[PDB]
Curated annotation (Swiss-Prot), chains A, B:
Binding site for Cu cation: H440, H442, H608
Listed EC numbers: 1.4.3.21
Primary localization: other
InterPro entries: Cu_Am_Ox_Cu-bd, Cu_Am_ox_TPQ-bd, Cu_amine_oxidase, Cu_amine_oxidase_C, Cu_amine_oxidase_C_sf, Cu_amine_oxidase_N-reg, Cu_amine_oxidase_N2, Cu_amine_oxidase_N3
Residues annotated for Mn(2+) binding in this entry: D449, D597, I598
Induction: By methylamine.
MF terms (GO), sorted A to Z: copper ion binding; primary methylamine oxidase activity; quinone binding
Keywords: Copper, Disulfide bond, Glycoprotein, Manganese, Metal-binding, Oxidoreductase, Peroxisome, TPQ
GO biological process, one term: amine metabolic process
Species of provenance: Pichia angusta
Protein name: Peroxisomal primary amine oxidase
Length: 656, 656
C-alpha cells in the first residue's frame, strides 16, 4: 500500500497511480485492458469538512479509473481503495466513449497518411502520393456523428498541408475529412465535399523570425529589458500544495481534466478564519463553430471533457511564461499501460505588482495629506494546448479579498479551405488567400462550490432598477432614485438566468444565516461577470443538447457528491439525449437551493469573429470574471497593509 | 510675443499664458477682471492636417480665455492671437456660470465656519460654537437649483466633522447643507432637513497606520520587495510631447478640463504610416446619486466640466503612483490673477510588462516546437481628486495595435448622515454606524475623433445573431449557424444606441473607402466596451437633461470645430434646458454621418452600490474599454517582435 499524502486533497502520487493500476490489472486478471484515466476520487464534501474542522476520521484515499478492454465496447470504470489495494466499486458502460488521451490521438496522423483512400483524396487535391509526409492533421473527437453514435470510438481528422516541416500548416487545409476508428487504428469513411477545392498554391503564412525576416524586412531590435527581481523572497508560503498569502489559505490541486482545482479556500479575518469556497474550477467548455455546412457541425469541441486541460497542459518552464520568482507544481497521470507519467512545471505560482490598491489625498493642504498603498496579486496558472489553440489560465487572488479568473486566448485559428472565387460568406472570414476562419464561440463553465462564511448558502441575481415612482412624484421628485433589486433563487428553475446589460446584472452567493453588523445584509461574494455571451446555437441543436449548461449564464443546483462535469462523465460521442450532467442535476427544476449546500455553475466566454489580425498567430485575447466580497467584511480588509507613502495632516503641517 | 511651441498641439507655455492674460487685461483696461480659464484653443482639424501632411501653413497659436468682471453677471470669453498679442474674438455670456477653480473653492470652508446661521446649525447638531475649527466641508457646485438658476454663482457645502485634524471626516457628516455665493463669499441659504440628526458620537473610521494599529492589533509586516528595473533604458522615445513606441506615434497634450488629450495617433505599418485617431479623450462625466430626498438631487457632479480633470490633477511624483523608469510631463494653467501656475508631474509615462502577446506549440513533438513572445504595454496616465474621490486614468497602448482606457476608482465614498434608528433604505447603504453611502453611478463620455486609415469614416453596431433559418432546415440543418449583423449608421439618429448583452454588441469605426485585401471588409477599429450602464435617472430628469450624452452608450455626430464638451461649454448651474452641447450636435437627428468627418462619443462607467468594503477608504474598482484593430492589418502586427523563446520543428529534431 502506498504512503498517504500530506493532505486528503493532494493529487495521486506516482506511487499511488502504479498501485491503482496494479490493483486493477489484478482484478481483471487475464484480460487485455488499457488505462484511459487514473485520477484521485476526492473525499465526500462532508467527510472532508468533518476531518478538517470536527476532528473527523481521515477520508480513505480513493482512485478513480477508466479502462478499455480489447474486444469489449465502451469502457469500464470503478474505484480502488489504495489503503487495502483493492477494487471497491466497478461497472461497465458499453454505450459510452471516454476522454481522448495523447496516446489515443498521437497516432491518427500516421494512419491517415497510410490510408489508400486518404491518399487518393490527397492526390485529387493536388498533392502527389509520394509527398504524403507533407500531409498533416489535427486529431479531433468526432464530437458527434449520427451515422455511428457511440457504437465505435471515432476521431475526425482535420487535414492540412506543409510545404516544409517548419511551416504553420493552418494556411493550407485540404477539403476532405477522414473519419478514424480509434481502437482499430483505421479510416472507416471520408467526408468529401460536393465542391472540391485543391490545395492552396500560395506561400504558407508563417511566423518564426526567419520567416518574418523573409516576409517583412527584418525583426525589430530586441527592446531594452524590463527586469523583475524579488531580492528578499516572496510573501506567500507553500506547504505542500497548501498556499498561504495575504490572509488567504487554500489547497492547490490538479487533475487530468479540469487542470487546476482550488479547494478549501478561506480568509484570515484578523484571527477569525472564514471559509469562502470549498471548491472552484473550470468544469467544462465548448467551442461551437457557426458554419452550417457539412461536416462543420462536428466542430464544437468540449476541450475539458474530451481532451482534458490537465492532459494537454504545457510544461511552463522554458517559454518564459511565468516571470519572476516562481514556485512550480508538476502533474502526474497514467499512460495506457498503467505507468505514471509526469508533466513538469504544469502549474506556476508567483506574485506580482498590480498597481494601486487604494489612495486618497486631502485637497485642503494641496494633497500633502495623503496615503497610497500599492497592490500585489497572487497568480496561480497553467497553459494548455488544444491542437491549434492555446488557453492561458490565471487564477488571481487580490488584497481586497477578491478572486479573479483571467483567461488569455492565443494560438492559431481553426481554418478550413476556401475556393479562389468563394466568399467566406456570413459564416467565416477570409484571413488569408484560400483560408476561411469560421465564426465560433469560446464558452466556459465555472464550477463554484461555495461556503460563504460557513455552511448553508443561497444565490441571487441583483438588478439595478429605477424607482417605480415617476418623475415629479413626492416619492421621486427629480426622478433620480434607483436601487438594487435582489431576486434570491428559491428553486433550481429560478436560478436559470443570463447576464443582462439592461440592469447591469450581477449574482450574489451569500450566507443567509448571518448578517453584516453594519449594513444589515448577509455576507457574500458577488460574481461580476460581463463576458457572458448567449448561446447562439439553436435550442434543440447538437451544441445545445451536449452542453445543456451553456444555455444560461448561471445554473444553480443542489450539492451532491460527484457532481463535477456538466456535460456528463463521458462526453465524446454523446448525442446530448438523456438525463445526465447538468440536465440531470436540474431535474424538473423544483429542488430547493435556498440555504443549503449548493453548486453554482457560471457560463462565460466570447463570440469570436475572426479577422486578419488573428492570423497566422493570434494576439492574446482577454476574458475575465471576478468574485468580490460585499458585506463580507466590515471595512476595507487591506488597511493594515503598510502604505507605500503616508503623510498625516498634522505631519504635513509640522513638516513645514 | 511669446516663442512658438515646438508642435501646434502643445499646451500653452507659461510665457504664452502670461502673454494671453496681459493682452486681456489690456483690452479690458480699467476694469476689475479675474481669470477663470486660459488654455490653448487648438487649430481647426483641417488646418492641422493640411499643415501636417500637405505643406500647409502653420496654424496661429490661439489662447481661449474665460474671465469674470466684478459687478457683471456671468462671464466673458474670447480668443487671443498670441503672435500679435491681441484679442481677436470676444463676447459676454451673462446667463451662464463657469468651471469652479481651486481658488473659487478653497475659501468656502472658511466662509461657512464664520457664518452665524451655519454656526447655529452646528450648535443644534451638537457641536459647540467654540469648536467650529473642527467643522469641515467639501465645496461642491450647487449642480442645479431651480431657486436661483444661473442668476448667482453658487456652491453647496457638504458639511463634515473631525474630532481631530488627522481624522477622515467622512464618518461624520452633519445633516444640513449651506448654500454659498461664490463671488460674495457668503452664505445665502441653508437647506435644513425636517428630521434632524445630530453628529455621530462614534469614533471616526480612520485609515492611517497609527489609526489601524489602534483599531486592529498592528500593521502587517512590510512584504518582501518586488523591484522593477530597466537597466538599458526604455523602448519609447519622447520628442517634446510627441511619443513614439512600438510603431505608434502620437501627441500627448493636456488641459485644465479633460486632463490628458491624445492627438494625431498613427501606426507605422512597415513604412506605411497609417492614421488611426485625430483626437481621443474624456470629454465629460457625471456621477448621479440615487436618493430622491431633498437636497440630494443636487448630487450629480460633472467633474470634468465643473471642476476639471486638469485642475484637480495630482502631482504624481511622491505617491509611488508610477513604478519604474518614468517620463513625466508638467501642467500649466492660469490663476485668478492671470499668472501661470504649474502642477509638476501631472502626467507620467512608462512601459511595463503585460504577460504574453502570443504563443503556440505543436503537440506532435510534445511542444518542443514552440514560439512565445511576451507583451509590453505603453501607459500614459494621471490621477485627479474630486474632493472625496480619486480617479486614476490610464491610457494604454499595446503591441497588437489595440488602445485601451483603464480607470481605477478609489478614494472615499460620498456620505450623508444616518439616524440611529434610520434605514439607509433602498437608496443607500449603512457602511458604518450613522453613515449612509447613497447609491450612484459613475458615467464617462469618451470622445473619439477618428481618422481610420485616413479621412472619410463611418460607424456601425455589430450584433451576433443566429441564422434566421430554423433547426432542421437545409440552410441550418443542425441549428448552429450564426453571423455578425452590421448596422452602419447613416444618420445621427441611427447611432443613438446602447450596449446589448443579448447580441454581445460592439461598435465599428471604419473607413468605407478602403478594403482589407484578404477579408474584403473595410479597415476598422472596434470598440469593445461592456461596462456600459443605462442611465437610471428618468427621462426628463435633472440628470438626463444636463447630461444628454449619457442616455446612450454611443452618440455619433458630424465633426465641427470646437465640438468638445457634450454638456455645453459652461456647465455649472445649467438647467439642462436648451439646445447646446450634444443636444445641439444631434439636432433633429437627420444629418449624415456615413463617410464624412464624424465624432464618436461613448458613454461607459459603473453603477456603484456601496458596501462596507468600500469604507472608510475604498479599494480600487476597475473600469475599462478598448479599441482593437479589425481588418485594419493583414496579419498579426506583432510577429516581427523578437520571440522570448522559439524552437522550430527542424530545430527541435536536430537538438536531439
Ligand atoms: Zn477563436
Ligand atoms: Zn462611487
Amino acid at each position: 500500500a502506498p504512503a498517504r499524502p500530506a493532505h486528503p486533497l493532494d493529487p495521486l502520487s506516482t506511487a499511488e497511480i502504479k498501485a491503482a493500476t496494479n490493483t486493477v490489472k489484478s482484478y481483471f486478471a487475464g484480460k487485455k485492458i488499457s488505462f484511459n484515466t487514473v485520477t484521485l476520487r476526492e473525499p465526500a464534501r462532508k467527510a472532508y469538512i468533518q476531518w478538517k474542522e470536527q476532528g473527523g476520521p481521515l477520508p480513505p484515499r480513493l482512485a478513480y479509473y477508466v479502462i478499455l478492454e480489447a474486444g469489449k465496447p465502451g469502457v469500464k470504470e470503478g474505484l480502488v481503495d489504495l489503503a487495502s489495494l483493492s477494487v471497491i466499486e466497478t461497472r461497465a458502460l458499453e454505450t459510452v466513449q471516454p476522454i481522448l488521451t495523447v496516446e489515443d490521438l498521437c497516432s491518427t496522423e500516421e494512419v491517415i497518411r497510410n490510408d489508400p483512400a486518404v491518399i487518393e483524396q490527397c492526390v485529387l487535391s493536388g498533392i502527389p502520393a509520394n509527398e504524403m509526409h507533407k500531409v498533416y492533421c489535427d486529431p479531433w473527437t468526432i464530437g458527434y456523428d449520427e451515422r455511428w453514435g457511440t457504437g465505435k470510438r471515432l476521431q475526425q481528422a482535420l487535414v492540412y498541408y506543409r510545404s516544409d516541416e517548419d511551416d504553420s500548416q493552418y494556411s493550407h487545409p485540404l477539403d476532405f475529412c477522414p473519419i478514424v476508428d480509434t481502437e482499430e487504428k483505421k479510416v472507416i469513411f471520408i467526408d468529401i465535399p460536393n465542391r472540391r477545392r485543391k490545395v492552396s498554391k500560395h506561400k504558407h503564412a508563417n511566423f518564426y523570425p526567419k520567416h518574418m525576416i523573409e516576409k517583412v524586412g527584418a525583426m525589430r531590435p530586441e527592446a531594452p529589458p524590463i527586469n523583475v527581481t524579488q531580492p528578499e523572497g516572496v510573501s506567500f508560503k507553500m506547504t505542500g500544495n497548501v498556499m498561504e498569502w495575504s490572509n488567504f489559505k487554500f489547497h492547490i490541486g490538479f487533475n487530468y481534466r479540469e487542470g487546476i482545482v482550488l479547494s478549501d479556500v478561506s480568509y484570515n479575518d484578523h484571527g477569525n478564519v472564514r471559509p469562502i469556497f470549498h471548491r472552484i474550477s473550470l468544469s467544462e467548455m465548448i467551442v461551437p463553430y457557426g458554419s452550417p455546412e457539412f461536416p462543420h457541425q462536428r466542430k464544437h469541441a468540449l476541450d475539458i471533457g474530451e481532451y482534458g486541460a490537465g492532459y494537454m497542459t504545457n510544461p511552463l518552464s522554458l517559454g518564459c511564461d511565468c516571470k519572476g520568482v516562481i514556485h512550480y507544481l508538476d502533474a502526474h497521470f497514467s499512460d495506457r499501460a498503467g505507468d505514471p507519467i509526469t508533466v513538469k512545471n504544469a502549474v506556476c505560482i508567483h506574485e506580482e505588482d498590480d498597481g494601486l490598491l487604494f489612495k486618497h489625498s486631502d485637497f485642503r493642504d494641496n494633497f500633502a495629506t495623503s496615503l497610497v498603498t500599492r497592490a500585489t496579486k497572487l497568480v496561480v496558472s497553467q497553459i494548455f494546448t488544444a491542437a491549434n489553440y492555446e488557453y492561458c489560465l490565471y487564477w488571481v487572488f487580490m488584497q481586497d479579498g477578491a478572486i479573479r479568473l483571467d483567461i488569455r486566448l492565443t494560438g492559431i485559428l481553426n481554418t478550413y479551405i476556401l475556393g479562389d472565387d468563394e466568399e467566406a460568406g456570413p459564416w467565416g472570414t477570409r484571413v488569408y488567400p484560400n483560408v476561411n476562419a469560421h465564426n465560433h464561440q469560446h464558452l466556459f463553465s465555472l464550477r463554484i462550490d461555495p461556503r460563504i462564511d460557513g455552511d448553508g448558502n443561497s444565490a441571487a441575481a441583483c438588478d439595478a432598477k429605477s424607482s417605480p415612482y415617476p418623475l415629479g412624484s413626492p416619492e421621486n421628485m427629480y426622478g433620480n432614485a434607483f436601487y438594487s433589486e435582489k431576486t434570491t433563487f428559491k428553486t433550481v428553475k429560478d436560478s436559470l438566468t443570463n447576464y443582462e446589460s439592461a440592469t447591469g446584472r450581477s449574482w450574489d452567493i451569500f450566507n443567509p444565516n448571518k448578517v453584516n453588523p453594519y449594513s444589515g445584509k448577509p455576507p457574500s461574494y458577488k460574481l461580476v461577470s460581463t463576458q457572458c455571451p448567449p448561446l447562439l446555437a439553436k435550442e434543440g441543436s447538437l451544441v445545445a443538447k451536449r452542453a445543456p449548461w451553456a444555455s444560461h449564464s448561471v445554473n444553480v443546483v443542489p450539492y451532491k457528491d460527484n457532481r463535477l462535469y456538466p456535460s456528463g462523465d463521458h462526453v465524446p460521442q454523446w448525442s446530448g439525449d438523456g438525463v445526465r450532467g447538468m440536465r440531470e442535476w436540474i431535474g424538473d427544476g423544483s429542488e430547493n437551493i435556498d440555504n443549503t449546500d449548493i453548486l453554482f455553475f457560471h457560463t462565460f466566454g466570447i463570440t469570436h469573429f475572426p479577422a486578419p489580425e488573428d492570423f497566422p498567430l493570434m494576439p492574446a485575447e482577454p476574458i475575465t470574471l471576478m468574485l468580490r466580497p460585499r458585506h463580507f467584511f466590515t471595512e476595507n480588509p487591506g488597511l493594515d497593509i503598510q502604505p507605500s507613502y503616508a503623510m498625516t495632516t498634522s505631519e504635513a503641517k509640522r513638516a513645514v
